Amino acid sequence: QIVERFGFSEIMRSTLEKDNTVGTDEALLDIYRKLRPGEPPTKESAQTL
Amino acid sequence: LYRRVINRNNRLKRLIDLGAPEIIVNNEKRMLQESVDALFDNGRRGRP
Amino acid sequence: APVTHIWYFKGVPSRLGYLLDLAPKDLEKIIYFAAYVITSVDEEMRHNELSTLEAEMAVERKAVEDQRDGELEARAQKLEADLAELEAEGAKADARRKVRDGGEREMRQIRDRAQRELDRLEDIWSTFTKLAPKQLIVDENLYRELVDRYGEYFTGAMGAESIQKLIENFDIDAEAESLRDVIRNGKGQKKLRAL
Amino acid sequence: DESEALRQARKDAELTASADSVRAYLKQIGKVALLNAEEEVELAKRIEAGLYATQLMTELSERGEKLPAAQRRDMMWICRDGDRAKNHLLEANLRLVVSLAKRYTGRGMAFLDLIQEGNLGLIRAVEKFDYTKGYKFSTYATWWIR
DNA sequence: CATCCGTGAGTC
DNA sequence: TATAATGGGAGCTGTCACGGATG
């Protein structure tokens, strides 16, 4: 769906490609890890905030 | 600021003498450190 | 309990941090009780027992490995046995694939759980081997394991007073000349920080 | 389900210490596990024995005479284990203080100074605790911390 | 040569 | 002062130009 909605541009295609990790779990964990370091990352504690 | 240090300094004394766990005693020491720091230079480290 | 003058700590450049050759971010984690710091270590006593201590640690790694290789075997036995028990029942071969992948998942966890133990025992031995003053042990469970095992061999403290001790055992004259030798070396970036 | 990534990413976060002095203390408490009702009873039993072996030697030291090398050492170990059990009970219900010290916030006294003074009451609470009554530790504690 | 933190930014 | 009670809570928002430590 990322390719569908934002595909009309090359700068978004260049972004999804340079994207480090894939996965719904891995994305939430990644954002959580950068937002609040120092706290145990559950798949349920990253979904919540 | 003086009142904050002496309060926490004299709480450290009670905690030390009561043979309190390291988790509580360390917590006091830290607060004391921030207490004395806040007196010397406020807002330098952390929120004022 | 002692407490550090904030002027000589947070003021940039950090005077204490320059004095003990301690990182500004590392100096924080010590004074404000977030990471332990090694104050002194009996380097001779470590050496005199180093051989004996190596052997002891070595037995543990094996005793951990031996249970792993044994525990894995028992599961491999029951995986093969259950896959044949669901064969005598005459289940669909595909329904055996679920059971097959289940076991391979279990064994993976067993191998990993033991691997983390080995890696813990590895990082423990490494840390004790290369233990010296001014080191920061930020992981607490390591330091606890480090104390219960080799507490006789080093002096570990935390907080402002730990920094006080560092200043006491500080050799000004020695650290001075040592820095002058780095100045005598041409290399710029390391001469900069030594200047 | 449990990926190797999360297992590494969990120890990465927990190891790093936050800048907030309030947050850092909250992080520390969460390590110790909450106590079962009967697990509390065990510690209570231990402290009693420990607190009692202490009262013995205290008055004996003043009067002079001391136990043999086998009795005193055996007596002494209870005193350590007793003093150790006390610290374990204080660490477990250490959350309890923080639970009802947050309510007195903004009254001219800092949060940390409240939690500490609360902990200070928890310490006295663990000494006068009695396990003969079928009451959990949490109730006799609360009245002491407030 | 360009970022990140700390310290400046008229008087009555 | 014995029912049982167990990990916070507001953030603050529109600078500016610079040196020094880090890249």
Percent helix / strand / coil, chain B, rounded to 5: 75, 0, 25
As a whole number of angstroms, the distance between CA D9 and CA A32 comes to: 10
Tell me which chain D residues have a C-beta less than 8 angstroms from the C-beta of B34.
Answer: 21
Query: Which residues pair with residue C37 across a beta bridge?
Result: C136, C157
Query: Which residues pair with residue C36 across a beta bridge?
Result: C137
Give the per-residue SS3 of A1-49.
CHHHHCCCCHHHHHHHHHCCCCCHHHHHHHHHHHHCCCCCCCCCHHHHC
Torsion of CA B40, B41, B44, B48, to 10 degrees: 100
Q: Which nucleotide is nearest to D14 (CA to C1')?
A: F7
Chain B: residue nearest C5 by CA? Answer: B37
Q: Is the peptide bond before C13 cis (omega within 30 degrees of 0)?
A: yes
- Protein C139 CA to nucleic acid F5 C1', in Å? 33
Could you give the 3-state DSSP secondary structure of residue D135?
A: coil
Outline where C89-136 has alpha helix (H).
93-129
Contacts of D72 (CB under 8 A, 6+ apart): D57, D66
Query: Which residues pair with residue C156 across a beta bridge?
Result: C38
Instruction: Answer whether C30's CB lies under 8 Å from C163's CB.
Output: yes
The one-letter code for the residue type at C121 is L
Resolution in units of Å? 4.0
Chains that touch A (3 or more CB pairs under 8 A): D
Chains that touch B (3 or more CB pairs under 8 A): C, D
Which of strand E's nucleotides are less than 7 A from any protein C-beta?
6-7
Contacts of C64 (CB under 8 A, 6+ apart): C114, C117, C118, C121
Q: Is the CB of C10 under 7 A from strand E?
A: yes
Gaps in chain C following residue numbers (C to N > 2.5 A): none
Q: Taking the CA of residue C179 as centre, how many other CA atoms within 13 Å lie in the half-sphere pointing to its CB? A: 14
As a whole number of angstroms, the distance between CA A2 and CA D50 comes to: 65
Could you give the 3-state DSSP secondary structure of residue C38?
A: strand
Tell me which chain A residues have a C-beta less than 8 angstroms from the C-beta of D28.
Answer: none
Q: Which nucleotide is nearest to B44 (CA to C1')?
A: E6
Is B17 within 8 Å of chain C by CB? no
Enumerate residues 20 to 59 of chain D having a beta carbon within 8 A of any beta carbon in chain A: 23-24, 27
Token pair, residue B37, equals 């720091």
As a whole number of angstroms, the distance between CA C84 and CA D64 comes to: 76
Please name the residue that has the structure tokens 């990790």: A21
Tell me which chain D residues have a C-beta less than 8 angstroms from the C-beta of C105.
Answer: none
Q: Is the CB of C195 under 7 A from strand E?
A: no
Could you give the 3-state DSSP secondary structure of residue D100?
A: coil
- Protein D132 CA to nucleic acid F12 C1', in Å? 54
Nearest to C128 by CA among C108, C149, C157: C149
Torsion of CA D37, D38, D41, D45, to 10 degrees: -160
Q: Is the CB of B44 under 7 A from strand E?
A: yes
Chain A: residue nearest D20 by CA? Answer: A38
Please name the residue that has the structure tokens 């042990």: C137
Instruction: Answer whether C28's CB lies under 8 Å from C159's CB.
Output: no
Nearest to C119 by CA among A14, D27, D80, D8: D8
Instruction: Answer whether C133's CB lies under 8 Å from C30's CB.
Output: no
